[PDB]
Structures are given as structure tokens and as C-alpha cells.
Design a protein around this nucleic acid. Structure first.
Ligand SMILES: [Cl-]
Ligand SMILES: [Cl-]
Ligand SMILES: [Mg+2]
Ligand SMILES: [Mg+2]
Ligand SMILES: [Mg+2]
Ligand SMILES: [Mg+2]
Ligand SMILES: [Mg+2]
Ligand SMILES: [Mg+2]
Ligand SMILES: [Mg+2]
Ligand SMILES: [Mg+2]
Ligand code: NA
Ligand code: NA
Ligand code: NA
Ligand code: NA
Ligand code: NA
Ligand SMILES: [Sr+2]
Ligand SMILES: [Sr+2]
Ligand SMILES: [Sr+2]
Ligand SMILES: [Sr+2]
Ligand SMILES: [Sr+2]
Ligand SMILES: [Sr+2]
Ligand SMILES: [Sr+2]
Ligand SMILES: [Sr+2]
Lengths: 160, 154, 186, 140, 95
RNA sequence: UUAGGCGGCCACAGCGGUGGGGUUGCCUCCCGUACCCAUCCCGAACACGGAAGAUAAGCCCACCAGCGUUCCAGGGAGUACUGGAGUGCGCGAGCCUCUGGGAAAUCCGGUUCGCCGCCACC
RNA sequence: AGUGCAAGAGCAAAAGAUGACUUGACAGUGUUCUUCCCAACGAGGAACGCUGACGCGAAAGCGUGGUCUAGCGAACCAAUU
RNA sequence: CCUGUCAAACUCCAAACUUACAGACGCUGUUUGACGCGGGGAUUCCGGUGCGCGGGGU
């Protein structure tokens, strides 16, 4: 299904699992990437991907964009490179679908999405000064798989 | 003491807003009233803010307006110095205008209609879709700004 | 204590001095409470009324100020308790108080107890208090006959400080006689 | 200071947790006073469907009855270090429990203005062993 | 509403804040009010008896006598005058 | 209030802690079961009777802020949100200006280890 | 925790537990709110009174069923007091 | 300990705002009699749109 059906925040917050059943599992494989044993403060450079518009990103896009991002980091910095990326958002919003015309229209559960306000950090990678151009590229690939336009903003990095 | 002037019509105006304007003795566009600056009166003009033009006028401007647009509680009668002298507690328009600004009395209290029925602004106003800070003619005004409007609506 | 959600009892409940549930049923009468309280050595009786910032004691009496009328005996017994109530009841009559309900606090409604003795004393002083005669001790025990007969099993004096050998419930009679007398500086 | 701080025997509870009686007879003879039945709550698969029903019995001994029992009860036991409660109590065994405490315990057992005994006035395992050991027997 | 009972949608108004939990002080349950006195209506969650219809919480009526120990308070629902039977426990003096 | 009784508000009063206080006074712990009363067993408690002892508990007094709570200053924040207005911007979801209001988390420094009423009483 | 049963709410020297006693789950008649916000409308419901008769308690007092909000039915006719 | 997120049927917090009553000002009424009461006559019980806030539905 198209994201056009679930990208906007036009419905109430629907997360209460004690009242919702049959919610599909999350396709998001990982939230902690790179070296999850090392700390974020142990890195000179901290780059984050910032969403420019308030939206809802389905776990399908979340996985795909996170995948196309980290896969690049693995390709350029190796499977054990000195970096660590983070997906700080979790798909809490349960999505329906009315799949009988408009009669008894309350739809059945089809998936989950993460609500992100404009200006928020969806991703945040921590790397060294050298690998800074690879993380920017991974994020460039990442924002190509999510509904909104994004900014690749450097939080810690006067090395330019 | 502030001078209120309705610049926006009644149609589509909220009833509670329209009712306030009527409580402030103003029932038509371009009608003006002199309101004391009290807590009670302040709440009222704040509610009317978007459909009105207000501010404290200069003694001079107030005198010009009173002379030209003030009226008795009943009748055509011109409110000139002689009129003021014979019916009010003052000696002339200036004496009246001073007490009004100093909030010592009211138009009604002196046998005058609470409303100053002004003429449309000569040369036109700054627009009723924007406030003063945005180049419009709505809301609170500078003493110089209010004078420009009132004098323009001589 | 633990957190924001924590509920701390009312002060007089933490202190375990006021049974609020009983207090309500008590106040429902509208009449003043005849607060009957005890101590290891003494016995007190207050006539309390309700007030805007707290209770109002209109007339009280303590076993300590009992000796002020000729009492050379101890102060934690039946004759003592009764007389204290009678004294309090009399001071109450003086203040305009005409009726009351027995408030015994955290004490037990045991038949023939001192709190009931206090009650009988106040009632005798002329106060109208809802009571039950067969829950009050028998007249003689109020006089302190149970203690005289205890001293009968002598061999060793019951009383340390010499008040007397075989004790005197007759003293009770003497004091009651004194209080019921119209004169007396209350 | 030491007087209103030296321990004493609060109570000695001799109990027999059977599970279904005839046992009351022996306790009455060994202790001296009358015993009391013991009920239970919650249904158990070990044939305990009847909630309120006799399962055991107990006897709370106080004063002489307590000591006169301990004189001929303690020798029958081999007191250990771990067998002591944090509040300065100990249970050995037919269970025989001894509740030990300082001179002003009534403060927490009375109705009027009751209060909980402060940690400092609460008896210690060590202070308990000592008091007991200092009366016809050995510790550890 | 899904149901039309008296306690419908009264989850908030008929519930104590955690610290106001437990039995309420007797003082206010015994308070005496005179006829003509203005009184604020507000049910005390902790007090079961002598309540009025929840819909009336927030009203400020006028004591006009009593029935037994409870009071008869006159209020104006919208435009309709009504007499409410209520105990002191759920009443407070205005001002 | 050189230690009491009944309370109001019901944590600013909680939790935890430190120091000080009692010859015929007070409150206690305390001593003790002939009685009134009492324990489904225990004068433990309740009840009654009483002072050899004690200030160690409690209690009263003075004090500490680590936790919890109340309030205050500054920071966050006139931010978030918002009642009124707009031929203001945006494809749009939405945003902005003007006008009237205005948080919360949190940081920091203070406050708070109850206040008050009636009665009794070296 | 428990409090018969949805859900939400109430309750700790209790509204819960245990024990004992008891039949107020009583007769008669009302006030008020609800049903039906505002604003007319029945049955039903509840809160709060009074009269009579009672139970328990030392007593204040509590009991007009179950802590509160569901568990209900007109005229005609029959049976019943 | 640290570190990453949420709630129409969560809340240690908490608006704007809505709302009861009262006072004040304003406006209004005492020949235009208000507020209120009683009676006669209706029509009406297919609505729609904008804006704000929504709930369902791509
Ligand atoms: Cl007492
Ligand atoms: Cl009602
Ligand atoms: Mg005219
Ligand atoms: Mg022109
Ligand atoms: Mg123009
Ligand atoms: Mg709600
Ligand atoms: Mg000390
Ligand atoms: Mg547009
Ligand atoms: Mg038929
Ligand atoms: Mg039949
Ligand atoms: Na169908
Ligand atoms: Na309460
Ligand atoms: Na039994
Ligand atoms: Na001490
Ligand atoms: Na009815
Ligand atoms: Sr929608
Ligand atoms: Sr069809
Ligand atoms: Sr994009
Ligand atoms: Sr003893
Ligand atoms: Sr367009
Ligand atoms: Sr302000
Ligand atoms: Sr009930
Ligand atoms: Sr509303």
C-alpha cells in the first residue's frame, strides 16, 4: 500500500495494546547499529538525520531506510568499523484499513508507524573525522526511502 | 481614556463581540465612543480589538471631534462652546474635553449622546484586514495615529 | 513518605489518639461530648463542644484537683473516677451545660469500668447523658468497697504512703457529700 | 540505663503444624495451660479444600509458665547461630519459638497511642544470644 | 454516551486525587448552614451517602431549610429551578 | 503544656537521623491479679489495683535535609499549548503575524523536620 | 488484598476479615432528584424525611437489602391479602 | 547504573477555555412594564455551507 494512506497525522493516537489485537510484528531488525559496546561520547563526530516535516513513517520504510543506510556503512567501513548508528524512533501508532461499503467501516489492523515531528532526529550516527563523508552518504540514501525531506546535520564536528 | 471607533461591520461578527460594541453604545460602523481605562472597560475593548480602532486622542483632536460630531441626548443641536456652557458643568468645549480625558465625567453624564457619529475617513483608512503593526488600521493606536484617524473622520 | 502518590493518615490517626469514625457518630447527636480519659495515676473528664478552629472545653475536671476538696486517697481508682465525673458534671451545670453524650475515646466499653463511673458521676451532677444502668458498676464498687475487701487480705498494707490501714470507702461518702452541697467553690 | 534495656521473655509459642487434633493432649501436659486450634486459608491440592478447619494447635506461654517450660525445653535443643531471627528471636524443633524483647514493648502492643519500637531499642541477634547464653547453656 | 446512568462519564469528578484518598474529616460532615446561605455543591468521593446528582457538581445554591439532617438547596439548572437534597459533607460555604 | 486532655488544617505535619529531659509534680514504661472485666490459649491485650524501680522505649524539648512533600527566586520559557482577528505564507499535511492568556519535565539556589484553636497545669 | 458479576469509581482502629447476635430484604405516607441536562412525558430507580413497629450497641448511632452506577413492564382479566 | 521510545479507553503535573454564584462597571426596565406568570394561534421535527475542534473512511 502507498504511504499516501498513512503518512499524515490525521487520526487519534492509537497505541493501547490492551484494546488492540492482531498487530503485525515490526520489520525493523535493529535499533542499535555498529559498535553497540562503545559509547557515543567516545566519538568526535556526531551526525543526525533530521526530518523536516511532521509525519508518520511505517515500519516498512523504517526498515528499508535504516537498511540502505547501515548497509552502506558496513560496505564502506567494514562489518566491524569504528562507528555506531541509532534509530531513536519506534513504531507505536497502529494502522488500520477498511478492507460492506462504508457500513461498519472501522478497519482491521494492518501495520504500525512511528510519529515524528518536524525538526526531530530519526537517525543519529557517531563516527570519526575520516568516516564523516560516508555517514553523510548513508543518510542521503536513508532519506530517499522516507516520506519527508531531510537535513543531514552535524552536532559535533568543527573538523571542516 | 480611549477613543473607540468601529471599522468593521456586524455581518459574520460574533454575537458576544457585537453585543459588547452595543454595550459600549456603538451600533454602527464609523461610530465612536469615549471609554475610561478601567479593568472592566479594558476587557471589553480587548474583545472588540479586531473590529475596532482605539487609542488615547490628543486634547486638540478631541476638541475638534466634539465640536464637529458630538450631539445632545436628543436633537440636532450643535455642541459648541455656548452649548457646552449652558448645559454642561464646563465653560467651553476644551473644559469638557479635558475632564473627559482626565476621566472626571462622561458625555451622557453631561447630557450628550455617548456616541460620536463620525464621517468616513477622508483619503481612506489603512485597511480592515490587518492591525496597526502590520500596516493596517485595526487594534490599538499611537496617540498620533488615533488623531490621524479621528481628524480624518472629522 | 514513599512518593507523591503516598497517603499519610490524619495527624491524630498517626498518633493513634482519635477514632475518627466513632467521632463522627458522636458529633451527630449535636450535644456536647463528655470526654472521659484515663491515665495510669489519674482520671480526667471534659465537657467538649464543637468549634471553628478546634474543640471547646466548657468545663473540665481532673482527679488531681479532687484533693482540693478533701481527698487524701490515690487517684487512679473507681471512687476517684466517679467523683471526678461528678465534679466535672457540676462545673458543667454551672456553665449552662445541660446534656451530653459519653465519648470514651480508645477505651473499652467494659461493664463497670471507670469511664462508665465517670459517666454515672456526671449524670448525678444533674447532666442528661444517654446511658445504660446495667453497664455501670454496682454502687458499692463505685464507693471503693472492692479495694477495702482487698486490703482485708492484708498481711502487708495495700497502700504505701499512710492514708490508712484498712482503707476508707467512707471517705468517698464524705467527698460526695461535700460536692453535692450547694456551697463549695467550684 | 542497663535495667530498662536488659531483655526478657515476651512469649514462648509451642506449636504443632499437623495438617488434619489428638495432639492437643500432649501440649497441655508439657506446657501447663490450655491449647488452641489452628485454622488455615486458601485451598490446597494436598486435601485442604475446607478453608476454615483444624490443622494444628499452639500455646502462648508468658511469665513463669514460659520459663518453667524453657528450663526443661532448651536442654533438649542444640541452639545454633543461624537459628536466630533478626529481631532477636529463635525457633527450634514440634516447634518451640521464643519471642525476646526489651522492657518497654507494651508501647507497640497497647491500644491507646501505640507506637512502633525504634531500631535502637529493638533487640539484636547478638544481644539475644548473650542474654540466653547467660542462662544455663551454650551458643553457636 | 453509550449508557444513560447517573454515574455516566463521572470518572474524573467522582474520584479523589491520591492524597485525598481515604476517609474524610468529620468536621465538614457536621457543619451547620443557615437558610439563605450560599453553598457550593461538590460531592466528596470518600463520602457515599447524602449525594446529589453528579450533573450538579459545581453549582452554588441557596440553603432553604433541611430534611432530616440533609439540607434542601435551591439551584437553577439552565433555566429551571430545582431543589436539591444534600448533606453537609458535600457542601462548602461560599466566600 | 518541666513531659497533659480534646481538636482544626490533614506530609510545610512523611521517612531516616543526632542531642537533651523527670524524689514525694505530669505522661509513661513499670509492679501486680481480690475484685468489675478479659483472652476460641495466654492479667500479652483488654480491665481492674497499685508505686520498688527507670528516663532505656514512648512522650515533650532542641537540631540535621539524605529520601518524600509545601512554597519562593533565577534558568528552561513567554518556549509548548491556546481564546479573538487576517484577500499573511504553503501543492499540501501545515505555518506565520497581530491581540488576550500561558504551562510541564528539568537545572540551580532557598524554604519545609508542622502551623493553629480550646481546656487544664509552677 | 478483599469487597457475588462489566467497567469506572469508594473503602483500612473499614465499606475488608473473623466471631456472635439479628431479620430494617419491616408496615404506612411523603419530600426531592432521576428517568426526560437545558425543557413537557409514564413505569422503573435513587437520595432524604416523617408515622408505626423492631434489631444491635454502653451510647451517640447504624439498619428504608448487597459500597455506588445494570438486573426491568401499562390498561383489561384472573388469583391472592 | 547507563542508554532508546510511547498512550482515545495512563497521570506526579497542567493550561488556554468553558461553567455556578455574588459584587462592580456597562447596557437595559419601571407612560416603550422589563424579569416573570397564565391563556389563544402556529409553523417546524428532509436542511446546507464556511471556520474551529473533532470520530469513521485511502
Ligand atoms: Cl484515655
Ligand atoms: Cl440531585
Ligand atoms: Mg439623537
Ligand atoms: Mg477618494
Ligand atoms: Mg485597503
Ligand atoms: Mg474524560
Ligand atoms: Mg534518651
Ligand atoms: Mg493557499
Ligand atoms: Mg390483553
Ligand atoms: Mg395470582
Ligand atoms: Na453489509
Ligand atoms: Na478523603
Ligand atoms: Na474453632
Ligand atoms: Na526516655
Ligand atoms: Na418515578
Ligand atoms: Sr481523520
Ligand atoms: Sr449495496
Ligand atoms: Sr524524501
Ligand atoms: Sr504485668
Ligand atoms: Sr491550492
Ligand atoms: Sr502575563
Ligand atoms: Sr447502601
Ligand atoms: Sr467544553
Amino acid at each position: 500500500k502507498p504511504a499516501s494512506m498513512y503518512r499524515d497525522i490525521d487520526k487519534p493516537a492509537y497505541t493501547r495494546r490492551e484494546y488492540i489485537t492482531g498487530i503485525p510484528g515490526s520489520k525493523i531488525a535493529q535499533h542499535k547499529m555498529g559498535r553497540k559496546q562503545k559509547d557515543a561520547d567516545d566519538y568526535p563526530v556526531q551526525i543526525s538525520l533530521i526530518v523536516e516535516e511532521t509525519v508518520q513513517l511505517r515500519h516498512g520504510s523504517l526498515e528499508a531506510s535504516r537498511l540502505s543506510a547501515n548497509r552502506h556503512l558496513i560496505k564502506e567501513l567494514g562489518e566491524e568499523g569504528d562507528y555506531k548508528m541509532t534509530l531513536r524512533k519506534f513504531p507505536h501508532q497502529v494502522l488500520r484499513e477498511n478492507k460492506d461499503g462504508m457500513r461498519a467501516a472501522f478497519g482491521k489492523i494492518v501495520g504500525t508507524a512511528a510519529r515524528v515531528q518536524a525538526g526531530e532526529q530519526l537517525f543519529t550516527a557517531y563516527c570519526n573525522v575520516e568516516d564523516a563523508e560516508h555517514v553523510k552518504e548513508a543518510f542521503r540514501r536513508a532519506y530517499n526511502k522516507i516520506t519527508p525531506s531531510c537535513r543531514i546535520k552535524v552536532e559535533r564536528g568543527e573538523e571542516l | 481614556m480611549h477613543a473607540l471607533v468601529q471599522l468593521r461591520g456586524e455581518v459574520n461578527m460574533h454575537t458576544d463581540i457585537q453585543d459588547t460594541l452595543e454595550m459600549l453604545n456603538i451600533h454602527h460602523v464609523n461610530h465612536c465612543t469615549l471609554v475610561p481605562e478601567t479593568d472592566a472597560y479594558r476587557g471589553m475593548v480587548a474583545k472588540v480589538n479586531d473590529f475596532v480602532a482605539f487609542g488615547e486622542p490628543s486634547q486638540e483632536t478631541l476638541e475638534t471631534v466634539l465640536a464637529t460630531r458630538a450631539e445632545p441626548l436628543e436633537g440636532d443641536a450643535d455642541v459648541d462652546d455656548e452649548w457646552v456652557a449652558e448645559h454642561t458643568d464646563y465653560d467651553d468645549i476644551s473644559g469638557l474635553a479635558f475632564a473627559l480625558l482626565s476621566e472626571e465625567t462622561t458625555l451622557r453624564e453631561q447630557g450628550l449622546s455617548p456616541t460620536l457619529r463620525l464621517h468616513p475617513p477622508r483619503g481612506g483608512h489603512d485597511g480592515v484586514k490587518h492591525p496597526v503593526k502590520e500596516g493596517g488600521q485595526l487594534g490599538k493606536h499611537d496617540t498620533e495615529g488615533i488623531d490621524d484617524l479621528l481628524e480624518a473622520m472629522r | 513518605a514513599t512518593g507523591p502518590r503516598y497517603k499519610v493518615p490524619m495527624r491524630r490517626r498517626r498518633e493513634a489518639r482519635t477514632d475518627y469514625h466513632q467521632r463522627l457518630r458522636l458529633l451527630k447527636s449535636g450535644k456536647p461530648r463528655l470526654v472521659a480519659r484515663k491515665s495510669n495515676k489519674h482520671v480526667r473528664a471534659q465537657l467538649v463542644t464543637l468549634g471553628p478552629n478546634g474543640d471547646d472545653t466548657l468545663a473540665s475536671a481532673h482527679s488531681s484537683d479532687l484533693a482540693e476538696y478533701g481527698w487524701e486517697a490515690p487517684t487512679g481508682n473507681m471512687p476517684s473516677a466517679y467523683l471526678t465525673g461528678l465534679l466535672a458534671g457540676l462545673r458543667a451545670q454551672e456553665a449552662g451545660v445541660e446534656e451530653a453524650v459519653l465519648d470514651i475515646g480508645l477505651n473499652s466499653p467494659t461493664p463497670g469500668s471507670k469511664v462508665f463511673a465517670i459517666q454515672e458521676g456526671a449524670i448525678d451532677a444533674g447532666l442528661d447523658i444517654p446511658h445504660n444502668d446495667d453497664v455501670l458498676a454496682d454502687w458499692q464498687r463505685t464507693r471503693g468497697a472492692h479495694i477495702a475487701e482487698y486490703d482485708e487480705q492484708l498481711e502487708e498494707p495495700l497502700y504505701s504512703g499512710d492514708f490508712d490501714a484498712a482503707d476508707l470507702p467512707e471517705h468517698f461518702d464524705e467527698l460526695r457529700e461535700t460536692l453535692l452541697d450547694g456551697d463549695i467553690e467550684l | 540505663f542497663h535495667e530498662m534495656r536488659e531483655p526478657r521473655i515476651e512469649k514462648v509459642v509451642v506449636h504443632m503444624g499437623i495438617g488434619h487434633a489428638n495432639a492437643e493432649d500432649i501440649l497441655g501436659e508439657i506446657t501447663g495451660q490450655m491449647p488452641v486450634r489452628t485454622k488455615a486459608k486458601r485451598t490446597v491440592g494436598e486435601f485442604d479444600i475446607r478453608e476454615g478447619d483444624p490443622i494444628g494447635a499452639k500455646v502462648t506461654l508468658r511469665d513463669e509458665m514460659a520459663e518453667e517450660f524453657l528450663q526443661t525445653a532448651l536442654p533438649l535443643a542444640e541452639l545454633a547461630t543461624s537459628q536466630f531471627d533478626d529481631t532477636g528471636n529463635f525457633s527450634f524443633g514440634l516447634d518451640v519459638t521464643v519471642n525476646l524483647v526489651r522492657p518497654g514493648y507494651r508501647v507497640a502492643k497497647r491500644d491507646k497511642a501505640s507506637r512502633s519500637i525504634p531500631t535502637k531499642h529493638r533487640l539484636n541477634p547478638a544481644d539475644a544470644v548473650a542474654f540466653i547464653e547467660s542462662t544455663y547453656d551454650v551458643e553457636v | 454516551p453509550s449508557s444513560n446512568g447517573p454515574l455516566e462519564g463521572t470518572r474524573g469528578k467522582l474520584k479523589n486525587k491520591p492524597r485525598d484518598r481515604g476517609t474524610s474529616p468529620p468536621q465538614r460532615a457536621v457543619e451547620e448552614f443557615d437558610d439563605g446561605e450560599k453553598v457550593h455543591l461538590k460531592i466528596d468521593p470518600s463520602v457515599p451517602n447524602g449525594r446529589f446528582h453528579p450533573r450538579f457538581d459545581g453549582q452554588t445554591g441557596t440553603v432553604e431549610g433541611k430534611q432530616g439532617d440533609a439540607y434542601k438547596v435551591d439551584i437553577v439548572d439552565g433555566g429551571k429551578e430545582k431543589t436539591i437534597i444534600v448533606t453537609a459533607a458535600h457542601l462548602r460555604r461560599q466566600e
